[PDB]
Design a protein around this ligand. Structure first.
Ligand SMILES: [Zn+2]
Ligand SMILES: [Zn+2]
Ligand SMILES: [Zn+2]
Ligand SMILES: [Zn+2]
Length: 207
């Protein structure tokens, strides 16, 4: 029952500038024009729907962007990749370019139980007028593609990155119903098959 949650002061610096906001969920930047979220988020949103880059409430954001394509992982795991139209619908401080207004996360090489982790995202975004929050805790179990962690989350954290102490991404917070009665939370743990699927969807050039 770890509850160590802080309001993010400045979302314009990494890792905070790698996190994106849906109307009611979270995602994060993994590469050029590319974000990760979960399948619950990808069921709710469609091509042409919009994300906001790293909003800090009404203090501003890195722009508003259109979802260009959605690619759900073909395995059972709760993970989706979305590609983003590079030209913003509404500009960020660094201009209209998605990539200049965000910084992508790198994959962690691995993780182990008891590692210190951080979840960054948008809990209760209506109630907390889209402020970004960091929630800190530890890994409780890693089994195949299942990551159980002890860090406080709320509705809206669905799709949040789970980060190691060096701000590399280890997994993505579940959007599905959690284990009943459990004070711990779940995430898809990034294994080689999942990393490969993601990497194959990252963009590299302009058309
Ligand atoms: Zn939903
Ligand atoms: Zn470009
Ligand atoms: Zn273009
Ligand atoms: Zn091409």
């Amino acid at each position: 029952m770890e509850k160590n949650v802080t309001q993010v002061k400045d979302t314009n610096n990494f890792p905070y500038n790698g996190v994106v906001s849906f109307k009611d969920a979270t995602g994060f930047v993994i590469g050029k024009n590319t974000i990760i979220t979960n399948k619950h988020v990808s069921k709710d949103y469609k091509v042409g729907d919009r994300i906001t880059a790293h909003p800090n409430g009404d203090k501003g954001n890195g722009g508003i962007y259109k979802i260009k394509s959605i690619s759900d992982y073909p395995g059972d795991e709760d993970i989706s990749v979305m590609n983003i139209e590079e030209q913003a619908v509404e500009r960020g401080p660094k201009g209209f370019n998605f990539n200049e207004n965000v910084q992508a996360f790198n994959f962690a090489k691995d993780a182990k139980v008891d590692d210190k982790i951080k979840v960054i995202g948008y809990p209760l975004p209506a109630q907390n007028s889209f402020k970004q929050f960091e929630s800190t805790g530890t890994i409780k179990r890693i089994k195949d593609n299942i990551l159980n962690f002890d860090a406080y989350i709320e509705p809206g954290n669905s799709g949040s990155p789970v980060l190691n102490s060096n701000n590399e991404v280890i997994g993505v917070v579940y959007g599905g119903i959690g284990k009943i009665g459990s004070e711990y939370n779940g995430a898809v743990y990034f294994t080689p098959q999942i990393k490969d699927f993601i990497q194959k969807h990252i963009e590299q050039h302009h058309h």
